[PDB]
Amino acid sequence: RPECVLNSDCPSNQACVNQKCRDP
């Protein structure tokens, strides 16, 4: 059960790192 998938998946055009949102 990952927290993130696609980069755009999160807000502020964040990035997907380690199956979880993060900074680009």
Give 15's Cβ-side CA count (13 Å radius). 5
SS (H, E, C) 1-24: CCCCCCCCCCCCCCEECCCCEECC
Q: How was this structure determined?
A: NMR
Pair 7, 23: CB distance under 8 Å: no
Report in angstroms the alpha-carbon separations of 20 from 11, 12, 13. Answer: 12, 14, 13
Question: Could you tell me the maximum CA-CA distance found in the chain, to the nearest angstrom?
Answer: 23
Distance of alpha carbon 22 from alpha carbon 10, whole angstroms: 9
